[PDB]
Amino acid sequence: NVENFKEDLFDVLFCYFPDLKTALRSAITATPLFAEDAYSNLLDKLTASSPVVKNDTLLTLLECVRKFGGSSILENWTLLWNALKFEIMQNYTNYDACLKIINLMALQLYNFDKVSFEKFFTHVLDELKPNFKYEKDLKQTCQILSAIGSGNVEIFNKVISSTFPLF
Amino acid sequence: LINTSEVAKLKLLIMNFSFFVDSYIDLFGRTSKESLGTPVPNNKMAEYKDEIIMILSMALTRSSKAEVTIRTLSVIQFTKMIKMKGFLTPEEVSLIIQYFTEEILTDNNKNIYYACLEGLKTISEIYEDLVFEISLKKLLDLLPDCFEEKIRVNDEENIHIETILKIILDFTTSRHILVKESITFLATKLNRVAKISKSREYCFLLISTIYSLFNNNNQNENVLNEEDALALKNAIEPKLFEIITQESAIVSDNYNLTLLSNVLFFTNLKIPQAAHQEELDRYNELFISEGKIRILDTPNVLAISYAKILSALNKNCQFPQKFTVLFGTVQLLKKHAPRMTETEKLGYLELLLVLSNKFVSEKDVIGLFDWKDLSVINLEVMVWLTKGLIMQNSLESSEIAKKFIDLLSNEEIGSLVSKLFEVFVMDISSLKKFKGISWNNNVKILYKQKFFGDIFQTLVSNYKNTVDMTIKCNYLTALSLVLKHTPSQSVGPFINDLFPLLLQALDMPDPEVRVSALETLKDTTDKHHTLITEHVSTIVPLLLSLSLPHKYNSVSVRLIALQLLEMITTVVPLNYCLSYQDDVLSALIPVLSDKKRIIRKQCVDTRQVYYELGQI
Amino acid sequence: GSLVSKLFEVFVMDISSLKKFKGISWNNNVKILYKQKFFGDIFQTLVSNYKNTVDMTIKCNYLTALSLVLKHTPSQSVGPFINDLFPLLLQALDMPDPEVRVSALETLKDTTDKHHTLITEHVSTIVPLLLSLSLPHKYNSVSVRLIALQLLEMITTVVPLNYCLSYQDDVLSALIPVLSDKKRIIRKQCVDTRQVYYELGQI
């Protein structure tokens, strides 16, 4: 019955939030009841200029997506992937962390439901197809597709078959 | 300690005695609820209590009103007397309450007013019963039976009607019994004045004060207990249904009805979970099944209040009659659409939103979809159902809105739908995620950002591939009306694609769109710099023209345009800035000569900044 | 008294037909410094009469006359009279005219920008008044609320930390119905004020 006391424990942890940071990461990803609020805050810290808090927020988001089941990510994937693409285009550093973010997003979406993962993949392909058609930012799109297809055999086969005919 | 009439000697006496009061506090202690019966053994201060009380009263009373400092010191010392333990008897504190009430009523000087307010708050938090008995009851008694009467506080002084209401608003902000009695008395007075008199301003003021009392105390979740809230509701509800059912003078006005509905929602918010089902059944019986009022048979404004009634009940409740009432209200709304007024239509649409977002499942909602008939009222119903669906952040909604975009391609329906697209994101004054309680509704925090992310890409893609300016204008209006309500700091990924459309949005009838776009581009120039440098040649003339007065340029729009001129001056390199110096100074002369005052100061600052940049 | 006090605003007012245009100078006889000189000749008598009155009707009439004179005068042209007018300025924040309120806010803005003591003793009354002004009202315009929030910013900046900590919780508690208003700029300003007041607590 923690839902009755929800939103009371969020404030003190976010007040304590920015060397010994793993405890906060573990606590903030304890239960899925964090998720629907956690992103709402963490995404804001994605706008911070200092790269240290950016890396910390990337690690927190990794711990979040890793242990928030499948429904919360299936709901927040559009906004989270939009933010990750924005920070990719802007650019254990941040780059490898966010590439692993995308990879684990794809893996979780595939593990939860096949139809939702297929919709994710086809939306990503439709939005990133002009990059292949044009000659703009080929490396970033290729790396993003590599992260997406680096989850399992089926996802790899899907991305390969849907990517090679393009180029 | 010698009585005197000189202001300086009295002031020095007060300052000197202000240390002896602290000495007495340190020796014994401070007042407490548990220590209200045990007295101090003995002291020589008690023998001097009469003299110090008498001299303090002379300092406060029978004294020239020009010496505000003496009165402020006197009331501060009286509060310090209230603080110290075991010094003042109940009669003395009652008399002090009387002096404070007389001072706050007769005089309107801000310093003495706030000092008396602080003293009254301290007395209330130490003695709530006495301050309720002497102060609150009198303040409630001053207000008259008829609007705009002659209030006789004393022989000569008369006080305004709004002053007493403001006084009631100020204190009792955290006192349970005081605010409960104030709410009960205000409800009784409103009911009586509406029954015996036909006035609008007085009833509106009373209902606004009641709404303020509920709002200022529901924000702490500790002023009113559950059983106390239930008792207050049992006391207030029949006396509000009496005015609601009768014609009175509040039904004819939409604002008064909306405020009373908000008050009903607030008073139904704090209910123990054991009584939600019975109250829901009683409301269903009273509003639909039985009674003279039939919202599902004859259109009326009253239905809107029912919506505010439903928004307070628990989400996971047994609601057997959900599909039937949904079909009935949909059929009535469709049938009587040409004849119903805007108020009743808005009420029925809010009811539809509440039903869609609270009880009925997504399957029934999508079953009630009909895209074949392109009637305006069907568009209203469809949009207001899909808004409630988006509030739930359902998976199907992200697809349904897409159809709307296709429906925007219509010729005779594109303009109306584009104008109405703003409904998707909009505050309702009844449905937010209140801190603490979380079962009131199903609204999600991140619905706005997700909706904007799913919508903006398709909107910009369609806008960039259109030839006739009608469809382009419709798409731009849709995107802008979505943008004006979404949080500003929540659009970072889409800035690059939205920047040309952001610039295009600066020609719009709605001032809200203009101010939102101005703030968004302020954030852009705060965080990005290349876009501003490349687009300055078009941004500067647009901002310069926006500063001029217009039927759509509000004061906020002009002020934010001047602030954006500040930012673009700061960010853009000097070489480009020198190219746009003479024109800005020439065209800003008719800006600091406008009607408003803050705009004049901002224009003066901008002129000074631009002039100083030239020499440096 | 009441009608004349209300009509007193006519003495200083823009006409848009009699102005000192650059170039031509024979159009009229208006002088540049008439406003400041008139305010100087009027304020002393007005404050002397207001401070020596018992019935609040005549006091209100005097205050209305002074406020209507002040609203049209430039805010940077009143330096000598700040010390005497500060209590009158504070009394002026209860007026039907939003222009009077915005002019008083601008004047006390200049005061707290230049002075630092008067704010120090009068903070205990200024802070609740600004907090109450931010709430929506039939006379509180958007400019009045925005300038009130800005004045909250600068009174937070100027007043020492010890006094500021005494007024932290109340400001945060009472600003909740402020960032939920209809307007957008007011929401941003309230968010910034909440952030500043929160950040001062830890530092």
Numbering used by the authors:
A (entry chain F): 208 to 225, 242 to 314, 338 to 413
B (entry chain E): 414 to 1029
C (entry chain B): 827 to 1029
Provide the authors' own sentences about this structure as they appear in the paper.
Here we report cryo-EM structures of the HEAT-repeat protein Met18 from Saccharomyces cerevisiae, a key component of the CIA targeting complex (CTC) that identifies cytosolic and nuclear client proteins and delivers a mature iron-sulfur cluster. Met18 is a 118 kDa alpha solenoid protein comprised entirely of HEAT (Huntingtin, elongation factor 3 (EF3) repeats, protein phosphatase 1A, and the yeast kinase TOR1) repeats. ScMet18 has a curved S-shaped structure comprised of 23 HEAT-repeat (HR) units; each HR contains two α-helices that are connected by loops. We find that in the absence of other CTC proteins, Met18 adopts tetrameric and hexameric states.
To the best of our knowledge, our cryo-EM structure shows for the first time that ScMet18 can form an intertwined hexamer in the absence of other proteins. Our final model contains six copies of Met18 with each protomer consisting of residues 9-1029 with two loops missing at residues 225–241 and 315–337. The hexamer is 154 Å long and has both 3-fold and 2-fold symmetry. For all chains, the N-terminus is solvent-exposed, and the C-terminus is buried. Each chain of the hexamer interacts with 4 other chains (i.e., chain A touches chains B, C, D, and F, but not chain E). The hexamer is comprised of trimers and dimers where chains A, B, and C and chains D, E, and F can form trimers, and chains A and F, B and E, and C and D form dimers. Notably, the dimer from ScMet18 hexamer is not the same as the dimer observed in the crystal structure of MmMet18 in complex with DmCia2b-DmCia1. The curvature of ScMet18 differs from what has been observed previously with the MmMet18 protein in complex with DmCia2-DmCia1; there is a 44 Å shift in the N-terminus of ScMet18 compared to MmMet18. Notably, residues that appeared to be involved in binding Cia2 (R1010, R1013, R1020) are buried in both the hexameric and tetrameric states of ScMet18, indicating that ScCia2 cannot bind to ScMet18 without disrupting these higher order oligomeric states.
